[PDB]
Amino acid sequence: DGCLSNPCFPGAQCSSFPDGSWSCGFCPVGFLGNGTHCEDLDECALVPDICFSTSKVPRCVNTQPGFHCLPCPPRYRGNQPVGVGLEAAKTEKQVCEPENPCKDKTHNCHKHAECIYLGHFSDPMYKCECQTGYAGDGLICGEDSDLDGWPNLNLVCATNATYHCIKDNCPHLPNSGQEDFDKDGIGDACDDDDDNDGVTDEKDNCQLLFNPRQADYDKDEVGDRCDNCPYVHNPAQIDTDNNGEGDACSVDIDGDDVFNERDNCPYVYNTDQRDTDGDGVGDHCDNCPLVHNPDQTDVDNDLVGDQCDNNEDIDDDGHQNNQDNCPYISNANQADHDRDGQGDACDPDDDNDGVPDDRDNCRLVFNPDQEDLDGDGRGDICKDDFDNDNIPDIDDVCPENNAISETDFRNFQMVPLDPKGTTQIDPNWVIRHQGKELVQTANSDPGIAVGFDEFGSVDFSGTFYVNTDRDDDYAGFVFGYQSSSRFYVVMWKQVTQTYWEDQPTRAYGYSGVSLKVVNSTTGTGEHLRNALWHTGNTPGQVRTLWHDPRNIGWKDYTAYRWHLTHRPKTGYIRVLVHEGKQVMADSGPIYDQTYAGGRLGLFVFSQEMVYFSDLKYECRD
Ligand SMILES: *[C@@H]1O[C@H](CO)[C@@H](O[C@@H]2O[C@H](CO)[C@@H](O[C@@H]3O[C@H](CO)[C@@H](O)[C@H](O)[C@@H]3O)[C@H](O)[C@H]2NC(C)=O)[C@H](O)[C@H]1NC(C)=O
Ligand SMILES: *[C@@H]1O[C@H](CO)[C@@H](O[C@@H]2O[C@H](CO)[C@@H](O)[C@H](O)[C@H]2NC(C)=O)[C@H](O)[C@H]1NC(C)=O
Ligand SMILES: *[C@@H]1O[C@H](CO)[C@@H](O)[C@H](O)[C@H]1NC(C)=O
Ligand SMILES: *[C@@H]1O[C@H](CO)[C@@H](O)[C@H](O)[C@H]1NC(C)=O
Ligand SMILES: [Ca+2]
Ligand SMILES: [Ca+2]
Ligand SMILES: [Ca+2]
Ligand SMILES: [Ca+2]
Ligand SMILES: [Ca+2]
Ligand SMILES: [Ca+2]
Ligand SMILES: [Ca+2]
Ligand SMILES: [Ca+2]
Ligand SMILES: [Ca+2]
Ligand SMILES: [Ca+2]
Ligand SMILES: [Ca+2]
Ligand SMILES: [Ca+2]
Ligand SMILES: [Ca+2]
Ligand SMILES: [Ca+2]
Ligand SMILES: [Ca+2]
Ligand SMILES: [Ca+2]
Ligand SMILES: [Ca+2]
Ligand SMILES: [Ca+2]
Ligand SMILES: [Ca+2]
Ligand SMILES: [Ca+2]
Ligand SMILES: [Ca+2]
Ligand SMILES: [Ca+2]
Ligand SMILES: [Ca+2]
Ligand SMILES: [Ca+2]
Ligand SMILES: [Ca+2]
Ligand SMILES: [Ca+2]
Ligand SMILES: [Ca+2]
Numbered sequence: 001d002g003c004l005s006n007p008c009f010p011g012a013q014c015s016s017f018p019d020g021s022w023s024c025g026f027c028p029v030g031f032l033g034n035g036t037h038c039e040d041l042d043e044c045a046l047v048p049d050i051c052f053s054t055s056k057v058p059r060c061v062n063t064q065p066g067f068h069c070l071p072c073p074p075r076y077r078g079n080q081p082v083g084v085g086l087e088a089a090k091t092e093k094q095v096c097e098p099e100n101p102c103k104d105k106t107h108n109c110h111k112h113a114e115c116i117y118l119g120h121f122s123d124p125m126y127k128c129e130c131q132t133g134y135a136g137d138g139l140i141c142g143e144d145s146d147l148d149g150w151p152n153l154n155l156v157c158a159t160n161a162t163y164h165c166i167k168d169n170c171p172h173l174p175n176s177g178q179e180d181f182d183k184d185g186i187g188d189a190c191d192d193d194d195d196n197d198g199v200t201d202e203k204d205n206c207q208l209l210f211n212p213r214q215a216d217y218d219k220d221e222v223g224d225r226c227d228n229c230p231y232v233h234n235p236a237q238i239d240t241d242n243n244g245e246g247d248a249c250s251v252d253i254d255g256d257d258v259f260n261e262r263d264n265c266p267y268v269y270n271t272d273q274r275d276t277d278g279d280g281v282g283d284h285c286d287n288c289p290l291v292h293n294p295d296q297t298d299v300d301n302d303l304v305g306d307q308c309d310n311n312e313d314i315d316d317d318g319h320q321n322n323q324d325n326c327p328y329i330s331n332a333n334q335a336d337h338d339r340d341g342q343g344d345a346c347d348p349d350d351d352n353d354g355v356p357d358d359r360d361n362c363r364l365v366f367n368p369d370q371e372d373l374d375g376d377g378r379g380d381i382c383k384d385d386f387d388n389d390n391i392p393d394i395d396d397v398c399p400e401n402n403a404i405s406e407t408d409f410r411n412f413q414m415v416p417l418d419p420k421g422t423t424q425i426d427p428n429w430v431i432r433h434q435g436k437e438l439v440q441t442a443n444s445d446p447g448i449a450v451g452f453d454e455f456g457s458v459d460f461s462g463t464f465y466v467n468t469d470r471d472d473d474y475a476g477f478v479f480g481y482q483s484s485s486r487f488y489v490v491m492w493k494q495v496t497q498t499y500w501e502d503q504p505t506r507a508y509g510y511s512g513v514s515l516k517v518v519n520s521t522t523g524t525g526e527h528l529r530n531a532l533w534h535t536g537n538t539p540g541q542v543r544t545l546w547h548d549p550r551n552i553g554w555k556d557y558t559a560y561r562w563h564l565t566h567r568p569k570t571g572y573i574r575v576l577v578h579e580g581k582q583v584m585a586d587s588g589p590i591y592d593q594t595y596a597g598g599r600l601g602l603f604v605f606s607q608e609m610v611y612f613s614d615l616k617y618e619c620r621d
């Protein structure tokens, strides 16, 4: 009777008595107390912890009837708890898993592509790369028979892609820059006459310029219309400031307005001419800027002149104690993104925004308020470009380092490993593909061309191809390069040969890929020379860490691909070498903590016509 007037509340059970009175029992699932005046419950705010709190405080959503778990935020995947009431709230809990299209096989990569996980917080998280022996954009992969990253045919990405889609213009000769001067679809590298003027390039004194008459005023054998110094002998055509007028006929070769002979750094632009120590070598080119040293002698090839050079480097990252922004913790790259003098490695706040490294959703970009308005766990201020060097993550070979984004050996140090007086045959390095391909031309002394970028953890690969039948000697590459007495080297001999100098020690150089760590008590010279050639250990010189026991030599005119994995933090090293698509050498895991990082470089020891093509390095920290 009494319940007929609905004095209670929608859903709430009204109990009616014989005398007309009533009482209100339940409040319907998900509501407050008092059966008469009833209100909505917050299952979220003050009960359990139903939803997946992505390093934050939000996430669970309270509705007027019931409650709501947000869908798993980007980079994650799970279920989405929906509940009517309160006993449904302690039971049922949101599990969100960290996504990984590589391990989850949800990727869109080609059968002959590898899905590569870029790391949880990367933009994007994964990419597609064609496997060795193939080329493309990762979605489509075709045969790449010389491993120079350009496929043998035009592929169905030849319209939508920048690189690796379009007929390799020298199908059988590594030429990762695909330079084709006359544009006749035959690349410079295999083209017989590069400028289509009828003079074959071996005879042509202006190889990349049309000049059929061959006019050569001075007999420097570099013809008129390409000679940067037409009236002055200069076969190297060196042009320091790449202005079109070569050094030979320039009174100011670096274009800095201070004339040569006045210039205290004749090769390096320095209008300001500052010379702190007064030694006549300006700071910009002074390898010992604080200490008098006009001769600039640098006997161990680390860019620190003999006079500053004390080798005291207690953490083995190759920067000495007095020149190390983290003297005690290895950090070969010396990264210091906030520029406060404390290296990323020892500094607990790398951008100086108050939010410490471990708790910062944009570790390298200033953002105290940690705005992440799409919920992807990354501050929106570093959305595609973690290190803020304006190169997006996907195109950045070192996405957590603003000093490096491109594989580039365009500028390199020549490190001569056995300098002398006449037998001095220097390596000749020619650079193509904007620093991503080097060809060594000469049957030369041991020598390295080492790039200037520095690495802790690193992956480094490159195409190895010897474009001649002559000789059977060494080529390869270095990593963790610190000084000419401190590097790891991978080198590769064709035929086993004992070195033609029995002094100072007999060196027997076996065929096969050799992984070695140089730790020389003498530095450059005959002792290290021989030790480098020798397969095995040489006390006070070289220690061989691995060498292919099958002893397989490289073949003439044959494309190989090496892949170095180096993780100095543990000491992990892995060297893979590929012939075409098939692995042909694998060191397996190696462990060596002699050097906790350093630079990369290419290596020759008495082998000419060596192509180091389609070079790539990446930071893997
Ligand atoms: C990069 O550009 C190429 C340009 O060809 C893309 O390849 C093409 O991708 C489309 C998908 O957008 C395929 O179209 C499909 O065709 C059928 C009809 O045959 C249509 O019914 C489907 O709805 C679908 O759109 C197309 O077949 C494919 N071309 C081939 C044959 O390879 C490529 O997809 C682009 N990269 C990406 C993001 O996938
Ligand atoms: C490379 O070898 C050098 C010398 O062969 C090592 O330096 C010596 O280290 C030992 C400790 O085992 C000391 O007793 C010597 O005094 C050191 N020699 C000198 C004069 O420096 C060095 O440890 C090795 N480099 C590494 C592992 O980084
Ligand atoms: C009907 O509901 C009204 C509330 O407006 C209440 O005053 C009345 O007591 C109810 N009828 C009964 C129980 O006799
Ligand atoms: C229920 O809440 C209302 C709020 O106005 C109040 O008037 C009523 O007295 C409450 N019931 C109880 C416990 O007496
Ligand atoms: Ca509610
Ligand atoms: Ca190719
Ligand atoms: Ca080619
Ligand atoms: Ca051509
Ligand atoms: Ca040519
Ligand atoms: Ca031509
Ligand atoms: Ca020509
Ligand atoms: Ca010519
Ligand atoms: Ca000339
Ligand atoms: Ca000249
Ligand atoms: Ca010039
Ligand atoms: Ca000058
Ligand atoms: Ca200068
Ligand atoms: Ca000086
Ligand atoms: Ca000096
Ligand atoms: Ca030095
Ligand atoms: Ca040194
Ligand atoms: Ca150090
Ligand atoms: Ca350090
Ligand atoms: Ca710092
Ligand atoms: Ca730090
Ligand atoms: Ca700091
Ligand atoms: Ca910070
Ligand atoms: Ca930040
Ligand atoms: Ca974000
Ligand atoms: Ca970047
Ligand atoms: Ca970078």
Ligand SMILES: [Ca+2]
Pocket (backbone or CB within 6 Å): 468, 469, 470, 471, 472, 494, 556
């Ligand atoms: Ca040969």
Ligand SMILES: [Ca+2]
Pocket (backbone or CB within 6 Å): 471, 472, 473, 497
């Ligand atoms: Ca030989």
Ligand SMILES: [Ca+2]
Pocket (backbone or CB within 6 Å): 443, 444, 471, 472, 473, 605, 606, 607
């Ligand atoms: Ca030789």
